[PDB]
Amino acid sequence: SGAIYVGNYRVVNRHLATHNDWANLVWEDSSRDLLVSSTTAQGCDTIARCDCQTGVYYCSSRRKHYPVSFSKPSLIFVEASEYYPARYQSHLMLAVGHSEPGDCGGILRCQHGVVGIVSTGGNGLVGFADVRDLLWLDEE
Numbered sequence: 001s002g003a004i005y006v007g008n009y010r011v012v013n014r015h016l017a018t019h020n021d022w023a024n025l026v027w028e029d030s031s032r033d034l035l036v037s038s039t040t041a042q043g044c045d046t047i048a049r050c051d052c053q054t055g056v057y058y059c060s061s062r063r064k065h066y067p068v069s070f071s072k073p074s075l076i077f078v079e080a081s082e083y084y085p086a087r088y089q090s091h092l093m094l095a096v097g098h099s100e101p102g103d104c105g106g107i108l109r110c111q112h113g114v115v116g117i118v119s120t121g122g123n124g125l126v127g128f129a130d131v132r133d134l135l136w137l138d139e140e
């Protein structure tokens with residue numbers, strides 16, 4: 001589990017969104033595994049605006065933050081889980097890093113701020129849904 005809290009937005013994995021998220025919906029995209037809902041309080045996270053390929057992510061199944069190198073956001077074939085059929089995920093970055101299902105929502109961050117959240121992994125893979133292209137998270 002986990003979310004990004006930027007401005008009056010809450011960014012979560014679409015597959016982990018609650019009824020309150022869906023009832024206060026701003027934007028969602030199944031191909032990216034992302035959903036954004038509105039919040040009453042302002043958040044403290046800042047979004048990175050960059051092309052970094054190194055950063056640090058939080059792994060709840062280890063209670064640890066790990067430094068990683070990660071690929072650029074791409075369209076990458078993702079095998080079945082309980083939430084989607086084997087399908088093509090978009091805006092996804094991969095790293096070698098330990099991963100299990102409930103890890104989704106952990107933040108990946110670089111020197112500029114929040115890069116994305118955990119979404120996929122296995123087999124020593126961890127996939128991050130990128131948020132750096134969502135420039136509107138910084139306004140309104």
Ligand SMILES: COCC(=O)Nc1c(Cl)cc(C)cc1OCc1ncccn1
Nearest residue numbers: 079080081099100101103104120121122
């Ligand atoms: C074995 O069931 C699939 C599963 O839940 N795997 C998975 C794992 Cl190990 C870890 C995370 C955080 C997400 C995951 O799910 C998305 C996903 N499905 C498949 C392949 C890669 N990423």
Ligand SMILES: [Zn+2]
Nearest residue numbers: 050052110112
């Ligand atoms: Zn960066």
